[PDB]
Design a protein around this ligand. Structure first.
Ligand SMILES: [Mg+2]
Ligand SMILES: [Mg+2]
Ligand SMILES: [Mg+2]
Ligand SMILES: [Mg+2]
Ligand SMILES: [Mg+2]
Ligand SMILES: [Mg+2]
Ligand SMILES: [Mg+2]
Ligand SMILES: [Mg+2]
Ligand SMILES: [Mg+2]
Ligand SMILES: [Mg+2]
Ligand SMILES: [Mg+2]
Ligand SMILES: [Mg+2]
Ligand SMILES: [Mg+2]
Ligand SMILES: [Mg+2]
Ligand SMILES: [Mg+2]
Lengths: 118, 138, 52, 177, 324, 168
RNA sequence: AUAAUAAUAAUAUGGUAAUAGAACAUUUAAUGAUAAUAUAUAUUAGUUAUUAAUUAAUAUAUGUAUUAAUUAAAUAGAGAA
RNA sequence: AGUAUGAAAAUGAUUAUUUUAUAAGCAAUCAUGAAUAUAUUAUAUUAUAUUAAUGAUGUACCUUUUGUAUAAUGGGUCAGC
């Protein structure tokens, strides 16, 4: 795998997958995972492993999952949080009972700190 | 001839040095007031010390007031969460405190489907153009 | 009755339980005392002026 | 061609002509593991990208010069000239001496209405821009012209003034990059 | 006894602590400790030094205290020691910022125009930006009065931990600012504090790890996003491009239509490329032909200036700005 | 007589209120609110003198009362310091004056209605052409300056979510 | 051998008539610190898996909660007569 | 039908912001441009709030019925009961 053009390029993107959910990122990008991370606390660093695609403007390395040796991709866990609280009402059409389906899903804000060809 | 446009930089907290979002937490209780029992117990019982030991970048203020028991956090962005912990047991209070410390200070917000990544960066590949496409349309 | 010393981790502290009323009373006494001090000094200055 | 990577379109599993916006089809499309050449489907106007910069603007010791990515897709022989000056089509001429210049200057001060820039250009086989560069007119003439322009501007409606402002804003925006 | 005397002795003690910044007192201050832990400052950087960095110069109380009727009262801070403030530190921090940031920018963009470079530098380390950074870190201002503090009966440790300058009480009350100098502005004080911290870090680490300060700066200041392409504003870019081509060993640039669509419409599209020989320099799209031509020239100039070489390359020293 | 500079911070509401105005009020006019509206809509943003003239030559009964009110507001403005040729009617509205006495209308074949007898008041706020109108002209000018132009081939946001994948 | 909280694996969680379990708002009675830096009510914007309460600002009242909490009870919750 | 107080709502007029004169149906929800307002950490390529560009989905509520968008019942609206 001649990975020289990617290595050379100033701009570079990745399409890493957490639980088969793809997230297309550059360095500085701020990923918002739609679940509560249990393993990592806030401040902890995540070394991304299942990286599908690593792309320049005109080239892209692709692997499933690209060789871990070829690249780096460090995310930082920058705040577990939640979505806004919502209460949709559930009811049938001639029935006074109206069940409130309250919802407030969890989020985990990552920040892609490092992304480079090793 | 070339001229500058005065413009300012955007801080990405994570990339260089991570500054921890939660900066200060205030435990507020009442000596009277049966709603403040679990808070009082928490303050008493060696959990707060352990917490402070764990997180020495957060300062833990402990205040007494007449009203309900309060957990007000204070974040780097300047926002302030305040959770009323009325009638909660010790463990519930601790969970609430954990939740607060976990939070990045930002306001709660509805996200649309797949609104995942938030970039300041211009696209690595360009924006599409019909004149510059690989397959020309008809 | 918690204190800042009680917790033994220096990022933890307990703010001082001084009642609002007591603080107000203290303020009243201090500003009053200043006023008394000032008034006596002004009187003295008036007496000195009268003398010469 | 330095690199002999296989080249790929940005491939959907669905019909691209009917469902170009459908991200799901793109997500589905898996391609075999390795290096590829995906030529960008974009103009390189705003890009500071290293694959976009031309080789002449790269430094001599730059490794990127040798690599084949600033692709010369277009050909200057095939493209026609746009808003090109007459000097660029048939070369610049440095023929007029000091005496001729002095005469031109004398003429312009004397009577800019009679001896206008275009007339001077026609006489001496040179550009109106060059005439301007050479010689100032009488400041009175300039003042008159400014006054005329102001009068014209005043003669406008509200709408026209707004349109002119918009045009000016657009022009300013062009030079931003 | 008298409460005035009690207050007076407290004030005197506070003044003495400010003069000293005794190490034990600084250590006791929770806010300082948390700041230290947050930034991951070196262990050699003492807590007294950190307190000092937050202490702005304030030798004498100004004349504007005499009248709150004119819209100012300075009743929060207490006079400082002449030889224990953030002033010398601040200057050193400013110098460091001016050196390192500028150097980093030059490394990134070795041909960047002088004015553009200056603007970029400003963006990275402007006073407002520095103040914002300080706020983010948690450098809070001593807004509370001395008397109020005494009444509450709070320790001097908290005071030491907060930022200390002649902050005008009733600054914008009833919507009335007084427009005082830089020595009474909050933003300026916060900027000084962030520069002073940097200077303190430098002082402690220089002999052991010389580049520790610069990696701290990189982490905090140089980590911030700035698209350099948004900084530029050209005037007559075609002429400038032609001059550049003349200067280098390049053929005269001419603009040519590559592609065209929607001529005779409200919004056409004209793609023009500025060629020098067979090589294209800049690509320019536009609604008009003229616009497209202009855009191609601007693109070419961007590519010239914002060229960023690799770290593996030997240093690129540019041949100055293209003087048209 | 001082070297102290200042910068004033006001809100939008504060700005609005502090501009010189004058607040006319009618007495308990005998009319409907609808009938008042039918006239008062004509006297929207007029100069006070023009409005007074219109009221004088109006066929309606409320008109005289409106004219009188305008005259009173002018007089008040003069007393304050303002000029009558400077004053324009900024706002003029009406309202129920309360205590409308209901009274049964007896109809044929043991039917009834209730006849109310409406009383209203007209209030109006006169503002100055010299200040308020100038201010809102300035605001309009600023807004015009701010306004981003129509660009033909302009940068519109690529609306929709990306979907973790390049489509180009 | 319990309780609270948190993990893991599993199963379950549509619901009229109906049955069962658990809460909250409101008002009164018993007990009851505190205080205009306070309390109550209202508006706006935040916060807590949110009929509820809490934070801040603003407004009006009051030298002040039959207040928090536990019990006892109810003229205890209204788009349907 | 006490006395004070009263930004409780329905309801009327007026002003401001915003949308609206080639577009068709419970008038909402979700997507999504734009405009405006506020914001003593908008550092911004910022955040919230308001607003019928445009797109998609969407047959009031209750009662009574095997079954109701029903052109079956009942309600002019809000306040108190
Ligand atoms: Mg229903
Ligand atoms: Mg049914
Ligand atoms: Mg299809
Ligand atoms: Mg009344
Ligand atoms: Mg009759
Ligand atoms: Mg009637
Ligand atoms: Mg069920
Ligand atoms: Mg009842
Ligand atoms: Mg009711
Ligand atoms: Mg209901
Ligand atoms: Mg239309
Ligand atoms: Mg219709
Ligand atoms: Mg019908
Ligand atoms: Mg019906
Ligand atoms: Mg009916």
């Amino acid at each position: 795998t001649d990975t020289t053009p990617l290595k050379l390029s100033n701009e570079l993107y990745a399409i890493f997958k957490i639980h088969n959910r793809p997230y297309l990122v550059t360095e500085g990008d701020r990923v918002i995972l739609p679940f509560k991370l249990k393993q990592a606390e806030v401040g902890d660093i995540l070394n991304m492993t299942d990286v599908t695609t690593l792309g320049s403007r005109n080239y892209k390395l692709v692997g499933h999952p690209i060789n871990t040796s070829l690249y780096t991709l460090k995310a930082t866990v920058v705040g577990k949080t939640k979505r806004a609280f919502q209460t949709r009402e559930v009811t049938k059409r001639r029935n006074r009972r109206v069940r409130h389906a309250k919802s407030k899903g969890d989020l985990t804000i990552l920040r892609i700190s490092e992304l480079s060809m090793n | 001839v070339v001229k500058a446009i005065a413009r300012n930089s955007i801080g990405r907290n994570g990339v260089g040095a991570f500054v921890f979002p939660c900066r200060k937490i205030t435990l507020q209780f009442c000596n009277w007031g049966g709603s403040s029992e679990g808070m009082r117990k928490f303050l008493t019982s060696k959990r707060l010390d352990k917490w402070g030991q764990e997180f020495p970048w957060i300062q833990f203020e402990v205040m007494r007031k007449s009203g309900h028991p309060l957990l007000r956090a204070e974040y780097t962005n300047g926002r302030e969460k305040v959770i009323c912990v009325r009638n909660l047991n010790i463990d519930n209070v601790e969970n609430k405190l954990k939740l607060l410390k976990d939070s990045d200070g930002d306001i709660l917000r509805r996200r649309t489907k797949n609104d995942n990544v938030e970039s300041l960066n211009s696209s690595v590949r360009g924006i599409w153009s019909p004149l510059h496409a690989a397959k020309r349309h008809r | 009755h918690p204190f800042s010393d009680n917790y033994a981790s220096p990022n933890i502290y307990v703010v001082n339980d001084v009642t609002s009323k007591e603080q107000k009373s203290k303020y009243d006494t201090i500003m009053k005392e200043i006023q008394k001090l000032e008034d006596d000094a002004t009187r003295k200055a008036l007496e000195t002026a009268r003398s010469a | 061609k330095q690199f002999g990577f296989p080249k790929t379109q940005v491939t959907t599993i669905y019909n691209k002509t009917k469902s170009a916006s459908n991200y799901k089809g793109y997500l589905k499309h898996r391609d075999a593991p390795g290096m590829y050449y995906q030529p960008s489907e974009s103009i390189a106007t705003g890009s500071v990208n290293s694959e976009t910069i031309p080789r002449s603007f790269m430094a001599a010791s730059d490794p990127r010069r040798g690599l084949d990515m600033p692709v010369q897709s277009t050909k200057a022989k095939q493209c026609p000239n746009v808003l090109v000056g007459k000097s660029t089509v048939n070369g610049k001429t440095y023929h007029l001496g000091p005496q001729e210049i002095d005469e031109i200057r004398k003429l312009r001060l004397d009577n800019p209405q009679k001896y206008t820039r275009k007339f001077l250009a026609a006489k001496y086989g040179i550009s109106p821009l060059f005439v301007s560069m050479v010689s100032k007119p009488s400041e009175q003439h300039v003042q008159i012209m400014e006054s005329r322009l102001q009068e014209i501007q005043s003669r406008w409606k509200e709408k026209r003034r707004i349109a002119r402002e918009d045009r000016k804003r657009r022009k300013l925006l062009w030079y931003q990059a | 006894e008298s409460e005035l005397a009690k207050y007076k002795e407290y004030y005197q003690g506070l003044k003495s602590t400010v003069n000293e910044i005794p190490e034990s007192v600084a250590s006791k201050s929770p806010s300082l400790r948390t700041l230290h832990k947050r930034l991951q400052l070196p262990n050699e950087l003492t807590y007294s030094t950190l307190s000092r960095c937050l202490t702005c110069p304030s030798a004498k109380l100004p004349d504007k205290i005499n009248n709150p009727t004119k819209g100012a009262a300075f009743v929060n801070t207490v006079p400082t020691n002449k030889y224990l403030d953030n002033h010398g530190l601040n200057i050193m921090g400013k110098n460091l910022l001016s050196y390192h940031v500028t150097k980093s920018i030059i490394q990134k963009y070795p041909r960047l125009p002088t004015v553009v470079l200056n603007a970029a530098v400003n963006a990275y380390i402007s006073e407002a930006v520095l103040a914002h950074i300080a706020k983010y870190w948690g450098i809070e201002v001593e807004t509370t009065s001395v008397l109020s503090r005494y009444l509450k009966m709070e320790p001097f440790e908290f005071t030491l931990g907060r930022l200390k300058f002649f902050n005008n009480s009733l600054n914008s009350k009833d919507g009335i600012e007084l427009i005082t100098g830089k020595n009474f502005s909050e933003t300026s004080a916060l900027a000084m504090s962030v520069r002073s911290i940097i200077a303190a870090i430098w002082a402690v680490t220089e002999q052991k790890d010389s580049q520790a300060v610069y990696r701290f700066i990189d982490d905090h200041i140089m980590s911030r996003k700035l698209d350099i392409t948004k900084m530029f504003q050209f005037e007559q870019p075609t002429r400038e491009l032609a001059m550049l081509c003349r200067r280098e060993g390049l053929e005269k640039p001419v603009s040519k239509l590559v592609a065209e669509s929607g001529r005779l419409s409200k919004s056409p599209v004209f793609i023009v490329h500025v060629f020098s020989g067979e090589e294209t320099l800049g690509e320019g799209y536009g609604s008009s032909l003229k616009e497209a031509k202009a855009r191609a020239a601007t693109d070419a100039l961007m590519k010239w200036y914002c060229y960023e070489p690799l770290a593996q390359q030997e240093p690129v020293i540019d041949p100055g700005t293209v003087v048209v | 007589n001082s070297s102290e500079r200042y910068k004033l911070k006001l809100t939008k509401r504060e700005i609005e209120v502090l501009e010189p105005s004058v607040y006319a009020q009618s007495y308990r006019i005998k009319s409907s609110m609808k009938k008042a509206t039918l006239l008062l809509r004509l006297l929207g943003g007029l100069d006070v003198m023009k409005a007074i003239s219109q009221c004088h030559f109006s066929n309606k009964k409320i008109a005289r009362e409106v004219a009188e009110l305008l005259q009173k507001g002018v007089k008040d403005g003069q007393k304050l310091g303002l000029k009558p040729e400077d004053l324009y009617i900024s706002q003029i509205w009406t309202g129920s004056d309360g205590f409308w006495r209901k009274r049964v209308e007896f109809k044929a074949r043991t039917r009834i209605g209730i006849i109310s007898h409406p009383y209203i008041h007209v209030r109006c706020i006169l503002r100055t052409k010299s200040v308020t109108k100038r201010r809102l002209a300035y605001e309009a000018h600023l807004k015009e300056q701010k306004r981003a132009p129509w660009v033909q081939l302009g940068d519109k946001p690529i609306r929709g979510v990306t979907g973790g994948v390049y489509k180009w």
